[PDB]
Design a protein around this ligand. Structure first.
Ligand SMILES: CCCCCCCCCCCCCCCCCC(=O)OC[C@H](COP(=O)([O-])OCC(O)COP(=O)([O-])OC[C@@H](COC(=O)CCCCCCCCCCCCCCCCC)OC(=O)CCCCCCCCCCCCCCCCC)OC(=O)CCCCCCCCCCCCCCCCC
Ligand code: BCL
Ligand code: BCL
Ligand code: BCL
Ligand code: BCL
Ligand SMILES: CC[C@H]1c2cc3[nH]c4c(c3C)C(=O)[C@H](C(=O)OC)c4c3nc(cc4[nH]c(cc(n2)[C@@H]1C)c(C(C)=O)c4C)[C@@H](C)[C@@H]3CCC(=O)OC/C=C(\C)CCC[C@@H](C)CCC[C@@H](C)CCCC(C)C
Ligand SMILES: CC[C@H]1c2cc3[nH]c4c(c3C)C(=O)[C@H](C(=O)OC)c4c3nc(cc4[nH]c(cc(n2)[C@@H]1C)c(C(C)=O)c4C)[C@@H](C)[C@@H]3CCC(=O)OC/C=C(\C)CCC[C@H](C)CCC[C@H](C)CCCC(C)C
Ligand SMILES: COC1=C(OC)C(=O)C(C/C=C(\C)CC/C=C(\C)CC/C=C(\C)CC/C=C(\C)CC/C=C(\C)CC/C=C(\C)CC/C=C(\C)CC/C=C(\C)CC/C=C(\C)CCC=C(C)C)=C(C)C1=O
Ligand SMILES: COC(C)(C)C(=O)C/C=C(\C)CC/C=C(\C)CC/C=C(\C)CCCC/C(C)=C/CC[C@H](C)CC/C=C(\C)CCC=C(C)C
Ligand SMILES: [Cl-]
Ligand SMILES: [Fe+2]
Lengths: 240, 302, 281
């Protein structure tokens, strides 16, 4: 009967849909590789989808995926075993080298831009009319690391203009230089800013930005990767 | 403990954002509304502006009329008394015409004519709203995903109040406008068709409804977990993959071998949800028209 | 076997139990101590289901059904063929689910990401435990739990609901439903919004988040924003399940009469209880 026809036809549709979904989710990361970077023999059951091209706003060009994949950075790791499937140990300082949970990706070294072509993120001192509207204003508070030592003070908030949100805290260190801290990795208290991920001695190693009034996508990745890496690697120095 | 990013710790505000222009007719936008600090702890603080336009006005007027028509009936069933109106609010019901009147528009008002009027207004309100969802995207040069997804919900609503009733030969088959009465109707529908747990489309619809909660829980949680790397800036992660997108992909890969991209997970999202009402609409449509009793049908499969 | 960008993330550490002993992968899959525990619990549970199937006399998946003990056993142990297998399988299932969650925690730590995923999954585990453990214990018998079978667990849903009349009348169930429906609505809008921005009218440039906020303000006068929508989907989904668990925990424990009669509290409020007319006068 008709209901039978409907259910069988629906399952065929579903199998096609799942095939489509699976292949769409292979647009990044494939082809698969062996641990040495050569192409793996087994690429799985689905073939790579035909390339699609995105036209980027503001004359930033195009992106075609899937396309030639390359880390575009040195990876300081070494095998710990003679067969496939074991962890790869850092050969230097995993925080400095950017591996493990401290990893960063080689995104473009340009700032993200808003719908008008202006920098999306800016220090609040340069963002006209922006101010703290609710909660504790962190500007002027001391910044404490997981070793419970003071590492610096907040001197500004970096804000997302189009989305009206606080994205980073600019923190001044003892030598007078500053660094950015991701807002999602700090705890604003009444008399301080607490940073669980890093001990005081690691604040100076946070990657610096090249221009004082803008952050690039590459810089944000290095900074955020570094900070999150302290959860695993600062550990010896964390106390509570 | 660590900050979890469920509520914002600090709010920041700047000048009211008037939004992108593209091909929008700015004469039809309202001014900006107030800023809500309450809302700003969880999402955006800004209220408005809103776009009006012809379709918007038509949809809002029709919509209010549908609502008021039902409200008038409730007041009448309450004998115009405010204490009875409140006490029995959930029990009132505006019912479709009796089976005797078939598909005709003759039915007297207290006997279904008022149901037909309210339904007319609802029909216009929803379809004009649909046109609005298509045009608001077109004016901004966006894809029409929103309008097409909305059509899946409209499909179930149309089957329930319009298509099934027409194919059955009577308006009496449609859903009544009432809180408890539409629940009673739902229960009765399953009893009358031999238990909807045996309708395969109903079972599929449930799998997508549950799967929608599973997926939003996964997706919502994943983006929050990688928000420390700017993960919710999904569009730029799609254009220029960052460590947020890599870590999210790896979480799902290492956990269950699933292929994941930042754009791709949104395709899963749209389809999981849309399939809820797509499959459901088919299941209801076939009930009574083609299949009188799902248990019987299941015993045979035809 | 690796994604093109994966190697740099496959470092040692983050394990909760065992140090480096199970710190490895099999293909794409991470193992860890909890991966081993989940495998153990799963294999044992599957074996016990297979054993229940031979006792029942069928290998048909649509007929296999493992039932909890009858009410007369209360909360005590039961013979294997009459509820005992269900009890052991339940322990295994619980062990497998919890192990799956803790393995997720190990992965989160290796990756340096938040714990939101395992935390969210815990809500699903709590709902399952509500049905097979908390409610049955509160009611005084394992037999109020649901059976493990494709169609028989639906028979249980239907029978348990109609014990209280039309289960639609449970107020917590109305709230749970509303969250489920609202979640699906929000999921469709989220998926569609992102896609519509990433895949604009043919030949146009990719849209920005500013266009997403503009689309929603034009449409309904408010945009929750790119961070807010993820927070919202998490909350809607978890709330749906929280209210689901709640609607079941109170059923057969504090309320055991017909759910439709509960609403009489409202219609019998002194102020309007005897006012004539309407539906209830
Ligand atoms: C009876 C049911 C009738 C009830 C009516 C309810 C209908 C509701 C449908 C809602 C669909 C939601 C889809 C979301 C979506 O992608 O929308 C954007 C999509 C693109 O939007 P755009 O703005 O035009 O383009 C922007 C970009 O250029 C392009 O942007 P893009 O890349 O995002 O879009 C590309 C997109 C293009 O999407 C589509 O083309 C949509 C396809 C619609 C299918 C409708 C489903 C019907 C269900 C049938 C069930 C059978 C039961 C009987 O790609 C896909 O999604 C492909 C889908 C894969 C389907 C697999 C089919 C397998 C066939 C079997 C093969 C054999 C298997 C081997 C075994 O919209 C559409 O293409 C419109 C579809 C409208 C058709 C409605 C049906 C009319 C009746
Ligand atoms: C699917 C099978 C049945 C069905 C089965 C059920 C069951 C079972 C339940 C509901 C529930 C609800 N259903 Mg129903 N429902 C059906 C079709 C509908 C339709 C429709 C146009 O087709 C509508 C408008 C509703 C409306 C509603 C709401 C009263 C309530 C919460 C829904 C929700 O969360 O949406 C989420 C969406 C939104 C974000 C926006 C909508 C907001 C809500 C509040 C609607 C407000 C407008 C108005 C209808 C309410 C009037 C109350 C005051 C006087 C303003 N149902 C079909 C006929 N529905 C639950 C309820 O609590 O019933 C009492 C419940 O337990
Ligand atoms: C939730 C409240 C009720 C309930 C009410 C219903 C109703 C009503 C229906 C289902 C339906 C289903 N239920 Mg049930 N169900 C309950 C508890 C469960 C549990 C559990 C351990 O708690 C499980 C595993 C299931 C499993 C299932 C699936 C057989 C089926 C599709 C669900 C789905 O897609 O979800 C969303 C999840 C996903 C899409 C992810 C993929 C999940 C896969 C498909 C699950 C397969 C499980 C497998 C068959 C059993 C174990 C396998 C081996 C023994 C290891 N139910 C409780 C008792 N369930 C529908 C059905 O068609 O039944 C015949 C249906 O109509
Ligand atoms: C005794 C009851 C029967 C039963 C009878 C029915 C019937 C009858 C139906 C369902 C339907 C469904 N049931 Mg069932 N169902 C039962 C048991 C269950 C169980 C369970 C655990 O036991 C579950 C989980 C479900 C789950 C489900 C859903 C998968 C499905 C509804 C999808 C949906 O999103 O509709 C909600 C979404 C919509 C109604 C679309 C609404 C769209 C319109 C456009 C909105 C207009 C808004 C309006 C203008 C108001 C605006 C107000 C605001 C203020 C603006 N049922 C038992 C067996 N069920 C439906 C179905 O699809 O079956 C196949 C349906 O018709
Ligand atoms: C005739 C039946 C009655 C009725 C009686 C009941 C009863 C009885 C129950 C519900 C419950 C629910 N009903 Mg009701 N309900 C009715 C009509 C409806 C309608 C409708 C449209 O009419 C709807 C929308 C609903 C909706 C709902 C949901 C609120 C809730 C189910 C979701 C849930 O608990 O998930 C919770 C999710 C889970 C339990 C899943 C747990 C999954 C675990 C942790 C992992 C599984 C892993 C698995 C084995 C996979 C491995 C496989 C791999 C292959 C390896 N009901 C009718 C009126 N309803 C159920 C509930 O609230 O339960 C708490 C419940 O028990
Ligand atoms: C794919 C499946 C899911 C889905 C998707 C979906 N729904 C959608 C969309 C999509 C993709 C939209 O784009 C569209 C939308 O614009 O959302 C923002 C919509 C939408 N889904 C809506 C509701 C809705 N969707 C539902 C379901 C679902 N929608 C599915 C689960 C449900 C239910 C029953 O679960 C409801 C209630 C609307 C919010 C919106 C469509 C709006 C619309 O058509 O308006 C027409 C008419 C008016 C302007 C009405 C005005 C009258 C009311 C303002 C007032 C009523 C009187 C009041 C004062 C008191 C009485 C109210 C109650 C207390 C009784
Ligand atoms: C809380 C909101 C929703 C939610 C969220 C959620 N689910 C999740 C997660 C999250 C956040 C995960 O991280 C985790 C996951 O990895 O997803 C891919 C998971 C997951 N949710 C799953 C299923 C699932 N979730 C469901 C529900 C929901 N999940 C909610 C609605 C449902 C239903 C019925 O609605 C199902 C079926 C799995 C796909 C996955 C967890 C996988 C897992 O635990 O693996 C360990 C266990 C095994 C390999 C098998 C064990 C075998 C047993 C020992 C024996 C079988 C016994 C069983 C009781 C028989 C039941 C028979 C039925 C016919 C009744
Ligand atoms: C790229 O990103 C994105 C953005 O950013 C740029 C966005 O802006 C948006 C846009 C999103 C929004 C504007 C937010 C949309 C809001 C919602 C979908 C819903 C929010 C609603 C709630 C939190 C509450 C809902 C309330 C519920 C479930 C309870 C009500 C339940 C009841 C049962 C009623 C109670 C009682 C009784 C006695 C009778 C029955 C019940 C009722 C009548 C009700 C999206 C999608 C996006 O993707
Ligand atoms: C405060 O008091 C006043 C009077 C001011 C009020 O305004 C209060 C008002 C309230 C009390 C209103 C309460 C309203 C509700 C309780 C409404 C509840 C509505 C539902 C539960 C609806 C559920 C399902 C509805 C369905 C599926 C409707 C489907 C409709 C259609 C598909 C439309 C079909 C079209 C028809 C038959 C006519 C078509 C004619 C043509 C010519 C095309
Ligand atoms: Cl995700
Ligand atoms: Fe998203």
């Amino acid at each position: 009967d008709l209901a039978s026809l409907a259910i069988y036809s629906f399952w065929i549709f579903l199998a096609g849909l799942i095939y489509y979904l699976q292949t769409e989710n292979m647009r990044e990361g494939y082809p698969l590789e062996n641990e040495d970077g050569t192409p793996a023999a087994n690429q799985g059951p689905f073939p790579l989808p035909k390339p699609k091209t995105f036209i980027l706003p503001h004359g930033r060009g195009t992106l075609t995926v899937p396309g030639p994949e390359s880390e575009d950075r040195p990876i300081a790791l070494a095998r710990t075993a003679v067969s496939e499937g074991f962890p790869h140990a850092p050969t230097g300082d995993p925080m400095k080298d950017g591996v493990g949970p401290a990893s960063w990706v080689a995104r473009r070294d340009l700032p993200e831009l808003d719908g008008h072509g202006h920098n999306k993120i800016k220090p609040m001192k340069a963002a006209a009319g922006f101010h703290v509207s609710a909660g504790k204003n962190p500007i002027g508070l001391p910044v404490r690391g997981c070793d419970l030592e003071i590492a610096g003070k907040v001197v500004d908030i970096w804000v997302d203009i189009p989305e009206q949100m606080a994205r980073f805290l600019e923190v001044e260190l003892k030598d007078g230089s500053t660094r950015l801290l991701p807002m999602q990795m700090v705890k604003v208290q009444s008399n301080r800013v607490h940073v669980n991920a890093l001990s005081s001695d690691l604040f100076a190693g946070i990657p610096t930005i090249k221009s004082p009034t803008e952050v690039t996508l590459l810089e944000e990745d290095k900074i955020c990767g570094y900070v999150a890496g302290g959860l695993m690697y600062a550990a010896p120095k964390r106390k509570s | 403990a660590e900050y979890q990013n469920i509520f914002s710790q600090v709010q920041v505000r700047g000048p009211a954002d008037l939004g992108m222009t593209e091909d929008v007719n700015l004469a039809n936008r309202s001014g900006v509304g107030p800023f809500s600090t309450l809302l700003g702890w969880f999402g955006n603080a800004q209220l408005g502006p809103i776009y009006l336009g012809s379709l918007g006005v038509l949809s809002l007027f029709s919509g209010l009329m549908w609502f008021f028509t039902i409200g008038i009936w409730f007041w009448y069933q309450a004998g115009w008394n405010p204490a009875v109106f409140l006490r029995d609010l959930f029990f009132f019901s505006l019912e479709p015409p009796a089976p005797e009147y078939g598909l005709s528009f003759a039915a007297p008002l207290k006997e279904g004519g008022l149901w037909l009027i309210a339904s007319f207004f609802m029909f216009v309100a929803v379809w004009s709203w649909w046109g609005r969802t298509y045009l608001r995207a077109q004016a901004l040069g966006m894809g029409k995903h929103t309008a097409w997804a909305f059509l899946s919900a409209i499909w179930l609503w149309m089957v329930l109040g319009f298509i099934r009733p027409i194919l059955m030969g009577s308006w009496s088959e449609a859903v009544p406008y009432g809180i408890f009465s539409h629940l009673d109707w739902t229960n009765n529908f399953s009893l009358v068709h031999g238990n909807l747990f045996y309708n395969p489309f109903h079972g599929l619809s449930i799998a997508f409804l549950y799967g929608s909660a599973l997926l939003f829980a996964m997706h919502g949680a994943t983006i929050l977990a990688v928000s420390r790397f700017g993960g919710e800036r999904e569009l730029e992660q799609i254009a220029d993959r960052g460590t947020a997108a890599e870590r999210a992909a790896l979480f799902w890969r290492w956990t269950m071998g699933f292929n994941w991209t930042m754009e791709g997970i949104h395709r899963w999202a749209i389809w999981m949800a849309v399939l809820v009402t797509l499959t459901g609409g088919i299941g209801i449509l076939l009930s009574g028209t083609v299949v009188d009793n799902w248990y019987v049908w299941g015993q045979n499969h035809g | 076997a690796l994604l093109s960008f994966e190697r740099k993330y496959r470092v040692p550490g983050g394990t909760l139990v065992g140090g480096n002993l199970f710190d490895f992968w099999v293909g794409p899959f991470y193992v860890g101590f909890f991966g081993v525990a989940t495998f153990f619990f799963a294999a044992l549970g599957i074996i016990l289901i297979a054993w229940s199937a031979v006792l029942q006399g069928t290998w048909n998946p649509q007929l296999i059904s493992v039932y909890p003990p009858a009410l007369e056993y209360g909360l005590g142990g039961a013979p294997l063929a009459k509820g005992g297998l269900w009890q052991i399988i339940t322990i295994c299932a619980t062990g497998a689910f919890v192990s799956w969650a803790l393995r997720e925690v190990e992965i989160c730590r290796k990756l340096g990401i938040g714990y939101h995923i395992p935390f969210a999954f815990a809500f699903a585990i709590l709902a399952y435990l509500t049905l097979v453990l908390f409610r049955p214990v509160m009611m005084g018998a394992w037999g109020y739990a649901f059976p493990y079978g494709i169609w028989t667990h639906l028979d249980w849903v239907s029978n348990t609901g109609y014990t209280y009349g039309n289960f639609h009348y449970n107020p917590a169930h109305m709230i749970a439903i509303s969250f489920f429906f609202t979640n699906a609505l929000a999921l469709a809008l989220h998926g569609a919004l992102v896609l519509s921005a990433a895949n604009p009218e043919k030949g146009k440039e990719m849209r920005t988040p500013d266009h997403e906020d503009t689309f929603f303000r034009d449409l309904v006068g408010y945009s929750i924003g790119t961070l807010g929508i993820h927070r919202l989907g998490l909350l809607l989904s978890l709330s749906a399940v929280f209210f689901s668990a709640l609607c079941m925990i109170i059923t057969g424990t504090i309320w055991f009469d017909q759910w439709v009669d509960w609403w009489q509290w409202w219609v019998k409020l002194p102020w309007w209880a005897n006012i004539p007319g309407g539906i209830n006068g």
